[PDB]
């Protein structure tokens, strides 16, 4: 098959979005590739709320293998809700043609979440079984025509926030350092395995007997149960803000814990630079509580410093260290 590279680029260590093209002849979009959802959507000339009016709209009349659908997609981004409706075209990314996909056309995205994200649309990269119905997640369709030269994919966050690259049907050794750590998923939804522990000096902090957590490149932050983060918060020195952040103060870098988490029998550092967000005048914690019990996000936080391998074909997660 093929292999793809799908450079990405950060806005804010927040999002990272890349390059596709719908239609024909091709309409391009910059869309979210993320692991915590699996449809694909991007907005449409019949969608009048502001965020559409402010982001690339497909013209269905300019494509020539354009195909309502006419079925119902409802999504929820953030605090954000969008409404669209399926249609088939033609996906191009990089060097893959993905002809009679099946792709959201957006309708209604009220609410400012929409309108400042910096990308069109969401590219959906998590288990069929996730997709809204009569949708198909954009990677199947690469996977059953045999578009890919392997059913995998990897992610390469970097920290320096230039060369981000998203790489589909291949590996590549020089964006981690030592060798490939594979843990099996335990749920095929999310891209969902088992956390041993977190700790902080020797010292269980967190996930206490085991937890559940997902690879999530559409999240920012390590997302966790309440009663865990706490702990973390109070352990590195962070305080709660006047808008409900957590602050570090800057240079107190040097002094704070490095945060531990144990995968698979391997254990996965975060040094107080990875977990603490550093722009204009403050100092943010990366980690971000759940109200209440659950599983954890590992969002960009983590993934920045860990290369990440995604495989359909063995259902494994591949960890590196991000060079």
């Not at 793809?4 to 806005?11: E, G, K």
């Not at 920290?159 to 590996?171: F, K, P, V």
């Amino acid at each position: 098959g093929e292999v793809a590279s799908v450079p990405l680029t950060n806005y804010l260590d927040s999002q990272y979005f890349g390059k596709i093209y719908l239609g024909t002849p091709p309409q391009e979009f910059t869309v979210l590739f993320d692991t915590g959802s699996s449809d694909f959507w991007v907005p449409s000339i019949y969608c009048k709320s502001n965020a559409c009016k402010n982001h690339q709209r497909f013209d269905p009349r300019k494509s020539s293998t354009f195909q309502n659908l006419g079925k119902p997609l409802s999504i929820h981004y953030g605090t954000g809700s969008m409404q669209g409706i399926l249609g088939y075209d033609t996906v191009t990314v990089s060097n893959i043609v993905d002809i009679q996909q099946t792709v959201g056309l957006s309708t209604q995205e009220p609410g400012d979440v929409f309108t400042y994200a910096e990308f069109d649309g969401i590219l959906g990269m998590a288990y069929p079984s996730l997709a809204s119905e009569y949708s198909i997640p954009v990677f199947d369709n690469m996977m059953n025509r045999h578009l890919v030269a392997q059913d995998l994919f990897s992610v390469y966050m970097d920290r320096n926030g230039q060369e981000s690259m998203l790489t589909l049907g291949a590996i590549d050794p020089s964006y981690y350092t030592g060798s490939l750590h594979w843990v099996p998923v335990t749920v095929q939804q999310y891209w969902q395995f088992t956390v041993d522990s977190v700790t902080i000096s020797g010292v269980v902090v967190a996930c206490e007997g085991g937890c559940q957590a997902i690879l999530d490149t559409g999240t920012s932050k390590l997302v966790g149960p309440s009663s865990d983060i706490l702990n973390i918060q109070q352990a590195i020195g962070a305080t709660q803000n006047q808008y409900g952040e957590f602050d570090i103060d800057c240079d107190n870098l040097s002094y704070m814990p490095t945060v531990v988490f144990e995968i698979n029998g391997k254990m996965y550092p975060l040094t107080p630079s990875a977990y603490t967000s550093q722009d204009q005048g403050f100092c943010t914690s990366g980690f971000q509580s759940e109200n209440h019990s659950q599983k954890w996000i590992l969002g960009d936080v983590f993934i920045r410093e860990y290369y990440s391998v995604f495989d359909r074909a063995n259902n494994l997660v591949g960890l590196a260290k991000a060079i």
